[PDB]
Amino acid sequence: VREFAKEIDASCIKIEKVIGVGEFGEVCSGRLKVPGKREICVAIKTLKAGYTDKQRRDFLSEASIMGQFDHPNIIHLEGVVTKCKPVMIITEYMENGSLDAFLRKNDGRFTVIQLVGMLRGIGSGMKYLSDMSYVHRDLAARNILVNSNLVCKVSDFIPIRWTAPEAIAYRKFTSASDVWSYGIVMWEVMSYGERPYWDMSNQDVIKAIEEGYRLPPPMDCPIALHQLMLDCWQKERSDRPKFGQIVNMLDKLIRNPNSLKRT
């Protein structure tokens, strides 16, 4: 048996403002208050006006997939509204928005241990997804959300410079190509949201990677963290660490913080 999205009575939802817009539709912030339970802030996603039946189905599919996941580092689904129009997907509200934006607005503001904690959370969520045979395909800081307590959660259920060479060249997407992407996310985090490969063109990036180029340590990045990035970017996908190993390695760095001394 599979999980599913719970139906939420529309009277329990109060939409407060629009906080994002896309080609798919839009996202709002609001409040959810169910009888007997404390009010929580939520995010509310809707389809573009005039959506078709097919679009409505593909939409309620993002919800059914999300309903399968219950982990502290994966965005939490509250439920759906389907008995009323328009259709909506409701999740927890992540107060600090996307990780890329958040770090760029807070350049230099966190400690190494805080940053490593964020990476450990992302890794834990990815271990959970990969455990379940899911492949994200689009792992990047822009697709991670952050709450008030700095907890990072995987969201978003070809970006060339986040994508493993075998996924670009042979369309082979696996957890191991997600691990490559995770390495890029590590670099984004430790650089406070710099653009991977800077001004290099997509073509230049592809050629450089094939010739053995890998990104350098971000400014003031511990060597141990950069070495882990390099492990994630092994050419042969089978040579990359698994997500469980990544999390274990981060846990060991956090437990033995002197290991973060060398830069």
Ligand SMILES: Cc1nc(Nc2ncc(C(=O)Nc3c(C)cccc3Cl)s2)cc(N2CCN(CCO)CC2)n1
């Ligand atoms: C675009 C945006 N989202 C934020 N938080 C979100 N939490 C959950 C989100 C989400 O999309 N859920 C979701 C849904 C609903 C359906 C399917 C799949 C998913 Cl994953 S979006 C915060 C934010 N900020 C704006 C700027 N800042 C200043 C403050 O006023 C900080 C806050 N902006």
